Each structure stands twice: as structure tokens, then as C-alpha cells.
């Protein structure tokens, strides 16, 4: 990502995109019988495996230590799931496309206590994306910034290693800024519109953080999975051998 | 803020800055006897009055409806308190300057259950500001963006009035982006450094949001004041007559 061109970062990120998964329920069977949170939790857990694969293809990420990769993902995984959900919901006003076979409106969120509040925030984000005409190339840049940025301030220590890690991350974020600006210039925005649009995009990331924080608060009202710490499951997933090479 | 120059926004914001308040405790008396949360809560409540005064001097803010002013402040007040705290702590590594007569280190945070975690996040933000060499002129721009941005996505409705309000806010944020870019150009940064520094600044705002959200979670473990809704107290403060004109 540090000698990669702007055109090469954009292609690398497009190449890395995870697949769109389906909800797992029998579509020949009724709906009142379904646990909406079970459906959503099962979907999200399945996406997480693919998020790990994606993160390893973000330029610069695997040059980090395993521990720092785990930390970043532990800090950003729900933001990353949510921006992906808002992105595929963009062309579906008033609805959230959790999966191609699971498209829910706000009243379907009332089904779970405290969940309509989260739905409403997600829906508003999707509407802002649509109104901004967010582009596929801009979205993958944003998703990678979330991955690199959300946990970069909470690394405990400040060892030599740690200082080098933070420098490298800030260097990669810098190149993704250069890429976003490059995309906007290519599109024919003036200098002035570029910086304004860059700021508009980056401020949405503070809303996504808000949504992740609220969603974490909401998810922690027990019912879901909280077995084995998240660190450990992420590490297991991230700490791959190379035998299947 | 919409026909204001970049030089006029910067001066308007510098002019609007609130005063630095002191902690209210008898400095002739011992410390173990002090409620650290009482001291911090009393300080923060006193700052809030001055925050309302400041917000009314941010270009564009008072052109909003009273209700929308209340909403923005309800969404941003803790972020705004925290960025002010990190800013005055910048030149005090390892310590948080809550007031000139109340300078606390992380171990003094352990005094309150769950508070050291918040202190540690604040301290790390202060260190990042220092390392970035954040400037007084950049800080007031950031503080005003927080005020305008944090609640702009959660307005319920979408009345004509509401749509006009959102447009105006996004227009003001745009001019503050123009101002930040103007400040950086004046300082002699290249085009490339400007956009990179703009992005570095705006991404810190996602960390400040995180800290506010965590702090709200922490403050809600009862002991503090939660009497009369915050909306209502903000409204009271904001809904001024003009008789003392
Ligand atoms: C905690 C469990 C389940 O996590 C979940 C479960 C459900 C969802 C909910 O469903 C999805 C499903 C896929 C997707 O890409 C996004 C979301 S968001 C939504 C949600 C989030 C928070 C909230 O308060 C209400 C709804 C999102 C995450 N595992 C997640 C991976 C590690 C543990
Ligand atoms: C809720 C009460 C008190 O709010 C407070 C009380 C204390 C502080 C704590 O003390 C200050 C004091 C001044 C300042 O500018 C910032 C902070 S931050 C800190 C804090 C915040 C969250 C947390 O979990 C732990 C420490 C910040 C806000 N009133 C606030 C205005 C309306 C109600």
C-alpha cells in the first residue's frame, strides 16, 4: 500500500471483496416460527469468516503482527459488517438487505426489543449513502479505513514494535486518502469538491462507529453467543498455518 | 458560514471559545475527602452552560430551529467536553488537565471503578494530538464539526423543514472543510499533505465518538445527575428570551 499506485490500491481492494451470503432458513416454511435474532446472528457469524479473508487482502494489513491484526479486527468487526449492510441496502429505500433472501423494513425490527433503534440508524445511513451517490470504489476505501483506523488508538503499550506498527498503519491510511482523492479527481470533481467529498465520507465513519457502539451495547443484552472470547476466535482464524498452500 | 470567508470563519470560531473553568474544592483541605466524581461532575455541568453560549456563536448554528439546536447539542455535548479536555491536556503528557487546578494522571482514575479505561483513551487522544502538532485554529474547526455532525443523521422525521435543515448543516460543514484546507495551505503544506492531514484530523473524530459513547455507558452506572431529561435542560438554556438585550 506504500508504493502501490492509487490505481493498484483500488484494484486490490475490489479484488478482495467478500461474497454476499444468504440467510439460512427453509424458505418453504413459515416466518413467525423464525427467530429473527437467530437468523441475523447466524448470518453475521458466517460473514466474519469471510471478513478475515478480506482483511488479509487489504494492502498493509498482513504486514502487521498477528496480535495487532487481532486487535484491529476485534475493534472494527461490527462497523465493517454494518457498512457492508448499508452498502447493499442503498438501492432498497426503507429496507435493510441483510441477505438477498432476507430484506427487512423497520417494522420487522420491532420484532426485537431495542432493535428498531439500530435499524433506524442503519436505514438513515443507507439513505445518506444513496443521496451522496457513494461509489463502489469509494466504499471499499472506506471499509478498509475502518479496519485500519478504529483500533489504532487503543493499542495498550508503546514498545518500539508498537510505534513502528502505528507508523505503518498511518502510512497506509494516508495512501487510501490519496486513492480516494485520486478517484474523485478522475470523476471530474473540482479540487474544492474533492476535499469536501472526502470530508463528507470520513464524517460518515463517525456515525458508523456510533452505530457499532450502540449495537454492541444492544447485543450484550444476552441471548446471543458470547462463548470463548472474541480475541481468541479471531486469533484462531487469523493464526493460519501455510500447509494448505 | 455560507458567505463568510475562510479567514472570517476562523476568526469567528476563535472569538467564540469558552473560558477555562476551575474545579470547585477548597484547596486548603485534604484530598482523600474529595469525591473525584463529584468534582468532575460539578466541573462538567458548569462547562455545559458555557458550551451553549459557544454553540450559539458557531456560524450557522442559530439559523437552525430551536428543536434542532437541542438535538445536536444532546448528541454532541460529551464529545465536545472531551475534545476540549484532550486539547488542554496536550502539553501535559500522561495527565489530563480537567481544570488548571485539577490535573490527574491515570492512577488517579483508578479511584473510580471503570474510569481508568476512559482516562486511558483520553490520554491516548491527547498524545495523538501532540504528535500531530494540532493547531489552535484546527482544533476550533474540529470542535464545530462535532457540534454540527454528530446528530445530523439521527433527526427522526424528514419534513420539508427538516430537509432544509440538513442541507444547511451540510453546507456549513462544507465551509469548515474549506477553512481547514485553507489553514493548511497557508501553513505551507502541499496539496497532498493537506488532504492527508484533513483525513487524519477527521478520523480522530471517530475516536472521540467512541470515547463519548463509552463514557455515556460508564456515566449511566448511576450516582451522578439524571434528574430532568437532558433535552429539557438544554432547551431551557437554549430557549432564551431577548430581554437582557
Ligand atoms: C455477537 C455474535 C452476533 O453478532 C451479530 C448478530 C446480529 C447482527 C445483526 O444482523 C446483521 C447481519 C449481517 C450484517 O452484515 C449486519 C448485521 S447488523 C445486525 C445488528 C447489530 C447490532 C444490533 O444491536 C442489532 C442488529 C449483527 C451482529 N457473533 C458476531 C461475530 C462474533 C460473535
Ligand atoms: C451527566 C452529568 C455529568 O457529566 C459528566 C461528569 C464527569 C465527566 C468527567 O469529567 C470531565 C470534566 C470536564 C470535562 O471537560 C470533561 C470530562 S470527562 C470525564 C468523564 C466522562 C465520562 C466518563 O465515563 C468518565 C469521566 C464528564 C461528564 N451532567 C453533564 C451535563 C448534563 C448532566
Nearest to A171 by CA among B128, B22, B127, B200: B200
Instruction: Tell me how far apart the alpha carbons of residues B199 and B205 are, in angstroms, rounded to a whole number.
Output: 10
Residue boundaries of the structural domains of chain A: 1-245
In this structure, is the dihedral angle defined by the CA atoms of residues B124, B213, A207 and B71, taken in order, positive or negative? Answer: negative
CB burial of A22-58 (b: ≥16 within 10 Å; e: otherwise) equals: ebebeeeeeeeeeebeebbebbbeebbeebbebbeeb
Instruction: Tell me how far apart the alpha carbons of residues A12 and B195 are, in angstroms, rounded to a whole number.
Output: 22
Q: What DSSP character marks residue A63?
A: G
Instruction: Tell me how far apart the alpha carbons of residues A240 and A31 are, in angstroms, rounded to a whole number.
Output: 39
Per CB-CB distance under 8 Å, the chain A contacts of B173 are 199-200, 203
Rounded to a whole number of angstroms, the distance from the CA of A213 to the nearest CA of chain B is 7
Instruction: Tell me how far apart the alpha carbons of residues A234 and A240 are, in angstroms, rounded to a whole number.
Output: 11
Nearest to A209 among B121, B125, B206 (CB): B206
Instruction: Tell me how far apart the alpha carbons of residues B145 and B142 are, in angstroms, rounded to a whole number.
Output: 5
Q: What DSSP character marks residue B61?
A: G
Q: Are B162 and B125 in contact (CB under 8 A)?
A: no
Instruction: Tell me how far apart the alpha carbons of residues B206 and A55 are, in angstroms, rounded to a whole number.
Output: 20
Q: Do A145 and B205 touch (CB under 8 A)?
A: no
Method: X-ray
Cα angle value A95/A101/A103 (rounded, 5°): 10
Q: The CATH number of B1-245 is which of 1.10.565.10, 1.10.3470.10, 1.10.1370.20, 2.60.40.1110?
A: 1.10.565.10
Ligand 2: centre distance to CA A13 (Å): 41
* Alpha helices for chain A (secondary structure H): 6-16, 36-57, 66-89, 106-109, 115-132, 136-149, 160-186, 191-219, 230-238
Nearest to B39 by CA among B51, B27, B24: B24
Rounded to a whole number of angstroms, the distance from the CA of A220 to the nearest CA of chain B is 12
- Nearest-atom index, ligand 1, CA of A218: 24
Q: Which three cell numbers stand for residue B84?
A: 476540549
Interface test with A, best of B185, B206, B212, B216 (most A CBs within 10 A): B206
Question: Using CB atoms within 10 A of its CB, is residue A121 exposed (0-12), middle (13-18) or buried (19+)?
Answer: buried
Q: What DSSP character marks residue B58?
A: S
The secondary structure element, H or E, covering residue A243 is: none
A vs B, Cβ pairs < 8 A, gives 86
Per CB-CB distance under 8 Å, the chain A contacts of B209 are 206, 209-210, 213
Amino acid at each position: 500500500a506504500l508504493s502501490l499506485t492509487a490505481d493498484q490500491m483500488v484494484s486490490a481492494l475490489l479484488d478482495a471483496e467478500p461474497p454476499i451470503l444468504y440467510s439460512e432458513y427453509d424458505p418453504t416454511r413459515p416466518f413467525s416460527e423464525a427467530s429473527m435474532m437467530g437468523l441475523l446472528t447466524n448470518l453475521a457469524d458466517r460473514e466474519l469468516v469471510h471478513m478475515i479473508n478480506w482483511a488479509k487482502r487489504v494492502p498493509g494489513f498482513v504486514d502487521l503482527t498477528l496480535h495487532d491484526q487481532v486487535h484491529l479486527l476485534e475493534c472494527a468487526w461490527l462497523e465493517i459488517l454494518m457498512i457492508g449492510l448499508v452498502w447493499r441496502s442503498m438501492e432498497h429505500p426503507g429496507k435493510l438487505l441483510f441477505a438477498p433472501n432476507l430484506l427487512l423494513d423497520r417494522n420487522q425490527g420491532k420484532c426485537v426489543e431495542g432493535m428498531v433503534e439500530i435499524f433506524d440508524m442503519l436505514l438513515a445511513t443507507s439513505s445518506r449513502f444513496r443521496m451522496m451517490n457513494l461509489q463502489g470504489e469509494e466504499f471499499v476505501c472506506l471499509k478498509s479505513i475502518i479496519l485500519l483506523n478504529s483500533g489504532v488508538y487503543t493499542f495498550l503499550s508503546s514498545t518500539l514494535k508498537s510505534l513502528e506498527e502505528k507508523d505503518h498503519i498511518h502510512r497506509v491510511l494516508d495512501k487510501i486518502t490519496d486513492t480516494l482523492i485520486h478517484l474523485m479527481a478522475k470523476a471530474g470533481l473540482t479540487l474544492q469538491q474533492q476535499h469536501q467529498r472526502l470530508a463528507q465520507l470520513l464524517l460518515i465513519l463517525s456515525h458508523i462507529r456510533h452505530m457499532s457502539n450502540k449495537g454492541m451495547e444492544h447485543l450484550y443484552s444476552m441471548k446471543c453467543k458470547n462463548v470463548v472470547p472474541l480475541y481468541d476466535l479471531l486469533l484462531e482464524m487469523l493464526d493460519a498455518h501455510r500447509l494448505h498452500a
